Write a protein that binds this ligand. Structure first.
Ligand SMILES: *[C@@H](O)[C@H](C[C@@H]1CCNC1=O)NC(=O)[C@H](CC(C)C)NC(=O)O[C@@H](Cc1ccccc1)C1CCC(F)(F)CC1
Ligand SMILES: *[C@H](O)[C@H](C[C@@H]1CCNC1=O)NC(=O)[C@H](CC(C)C)NC(=O)O[C@@H](Cc1ccccc1)C1CCC(F)(F)CC1
Lengths: 297, 299
């Protein structure tokens, strides 16, 4: 099943941020609140905002930050790329051990979707090769964050800013830099051609086998390069030797050599699933990493 | 449409571990009571077929190790209610949310916080199947993990995890210790009924497709509830109840499509197939999104 990290450590950091008639979510760590900078915009501003110009015209008191019932007083503000940093007079006692990371395409993370500073739901996402994410975000979800948890440490990797015409989503790392060629302006933006995350499809095929589902296997094999030629033809990402190494544990667990599973995937790509299903899906799933599969099986 | 779990923090604040001897599982700490599966009192060998009453008679408060993290919670009373143990502890959980215990119906969905040794590992959304199993992800040590819904501020606990069936699916109790389905907490082979498709949820999914502009399958006809139920059963679909018709009300009102007209549309899909088409980007009809899940995600 698609499993997210427990969201409690992040819930304790969500607040509401309002400027004018614009409300969204912020992330309160220690005495700083992080949020998308387009909170400072009006309707007119959003088409071609000059953010540095808009921000110098703002005072601390134009920012209304609420942690539940309690307003937090803003005593400082700065902008780092597409993120606004609001210094507040009080520290969050619920601040977890945390870091800010920038994730790579193909990696997965959990999203805590929030509205008006209140958590609504949690789900698992992957950073697509074209640097979009297939999220579930509505009006008011900006400032929702994505994260992974290791031991007691929350690694924040994503802050939500926008939806594209196709319905997929785009956002930034916590330094305010977009993933992908996108801009925080109210304009229709296309992404580059997406590709399928091959190492993740293979991991999920291994998961299907670990759960006793093996109709798709075969006795053929393939070289790494010959598989990569077919993959690219079908708009699948190439598989590196590191990807092969990272699948080792799953190969050992099942006794199916990585390149043998590549041969299975090749046959699926060339012939399709013939109305069949794998782990209940009519489509090859590519948003489980090898680590996700291992951690859960 | 994503499988979206509830935020898990209010439940994370209630997870503890319970150990008897070397048997450890998870428990749920609310106020000054810890709830857990009663088979914590079994040796691995007693699980073959345990006599729980006799096993518990030999137990005292001081045989139970309850820990929140590595901090011990002293047990001051114990009792067994059906298949759950209730351990009274000397500290009221400061993180107790507003809560209730509810018994869910097959087809309803809930979030599971999968825990090991009292530590949450992940959260995911589950549906109770019509045969009273869930298709969970649960490893050794996961028993006592709970399933829940959140309404406003209030956590409704509906599931506590006890066992895995030969087919890989999972079975458990409500928080009063009453199993869902015909299962018992004994380490013996037990078969679920053949499963069926959750009709009310497929209908919810068809309403969601309409809301998003995908409506090629809407037909000109209607049906009675009884005629629909008799046909649906021939395709291994669950019959609808009056409660199902009522919980489809909001989506019916939002789209202007009567419930029985949507049933007629589904009947046609069942009798004629998708004729090569797709709905919401899928050749398969999805049955693990409830009417509430649709509303919760679309609006
Ligand atoms: C929690 O204590 C644990 C969770 C199980 C273990 C793995 N996945 C799960 O969901 N529950 C049990 O171990 C449970 C205890 C009984 C007293 C109810 N027994 C159980 O789940 O048995 C199944 C899995 C298992 C196999 C081998 C060792 C331990 C557990 C068996 C599978 C085959 C069967 F169905 F025929 C009999 C039970
Ligand atoms: C922040 O909460 C919000 C989240 C969006 C809202 C819907 N789903 C989301 O994920 N982001 C924005 O409002 C963002 C603001 C810019 C200044 C960066 N704009 C945005 O996402 O625009 C898309 C969605 C939208 C539609 C209608 C009204 C408001 C927002 C548009 C999609 C259609 C388009 F491509 F033509 C233009 C952008």
């Amino acid at each position: 099943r698609k499993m997210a990290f427990p969201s409690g450590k992040v819930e304790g950091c969500m607040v509401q941020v309002t400027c004018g008639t614009t409300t969204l979510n912020g992330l309160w760590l220690d005495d700083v609140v992080y949020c998308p900078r387009h909170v400072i915009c009006t309707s007119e501003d959003m088409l071609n905002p000059n953010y540095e110009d808009l921000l110098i015209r703002k005072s601390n008191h134009n920012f209304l930050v609420q942690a539940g019932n309690v307003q937090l007083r803003v005593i400082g503000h700065s902008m780092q790329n597409c993120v606004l940093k609001l210094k507040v007079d009080t520290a969050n006692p619920k601040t977890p051990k945390y870091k800010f990371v920038r994730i790579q395409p193909g990696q997965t993370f959990s999203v805590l979707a929030c509205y008006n500073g209140s958590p609504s739901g949690v789900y698992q996402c992957a950073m697509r090769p074209n640097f979009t994410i297939k999220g579930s975000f509505l009006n008011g979800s900006c400032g929702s964050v994505g994260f992974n948890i290791d031991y007691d440490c929350v690694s924040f990797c994503y802050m939500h800013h926008m939806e594209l015409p196709t319905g997929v989503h785009a956002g930034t790392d916590l330094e305010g830099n977009f993933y992908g060629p996108f801009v925080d302006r109210q304009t229709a933006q296309a992404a580059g051609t997406d590709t399928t995350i091959t190492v993740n499809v293979l991991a999920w095929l291994y998961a299907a086998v670990i759960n006793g589902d093996r109709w798709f296997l075969n006795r053929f094999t393939t070289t790494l390069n010959d598989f990569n030629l077919v993959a690219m033809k079908y708009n699948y990402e190439p598989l590196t030797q590191d990807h092969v190494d990272i699948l080792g544990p799953l190969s050992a667990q099942t006794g199916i050599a990585v390149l043998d599973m590549c041969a299975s995937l090749k046959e699926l790509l060339q012939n399709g699933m013939n109305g069949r299903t794998i782990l209940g899906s009519a489509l090859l799933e590519d948003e489980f990493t090898p680590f996700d599969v291992v951690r859960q099986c």
